Amino acid sequence: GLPWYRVHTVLINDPGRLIAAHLMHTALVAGWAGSMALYELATFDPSDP
């Protein structure tokens, strides 16, 4: 019986699995950038600055 907020604690020690974590919140952000980036890009109108 390990409650959820405590579930991300898993690692704390074992920096290995953790690297892969940050290695993700990092691959998840980067994505979002290119993501909405495309999006906004899919809508910005240049017609008049």
Partner 1 sequence: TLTYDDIVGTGLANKCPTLDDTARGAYPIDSSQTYRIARLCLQPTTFLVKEEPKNKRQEAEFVPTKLVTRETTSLDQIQGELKVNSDGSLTFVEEDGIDFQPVTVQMAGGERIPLLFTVKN
Among 9, 13, 43, 47, binds partner 1 (CB under 8 A): 47
List interacting residues with ligand CLA (CB under 6 A).
4-5, 7-9, 15, 18-19, 22-23, 25-26, 28-30, 32-33, 37
Q: Give the separation between CA 11 and CA 9, rounded to whole angstroms.
A: 5
- Cα dist from 24 to 5, 17, 34, 37, 40, whole Å: 18, 11, 15, 19, 24
Q: Contact letters (x/-) for partner 1, 3-32, by CB under 8 A?
A: ------------------------------
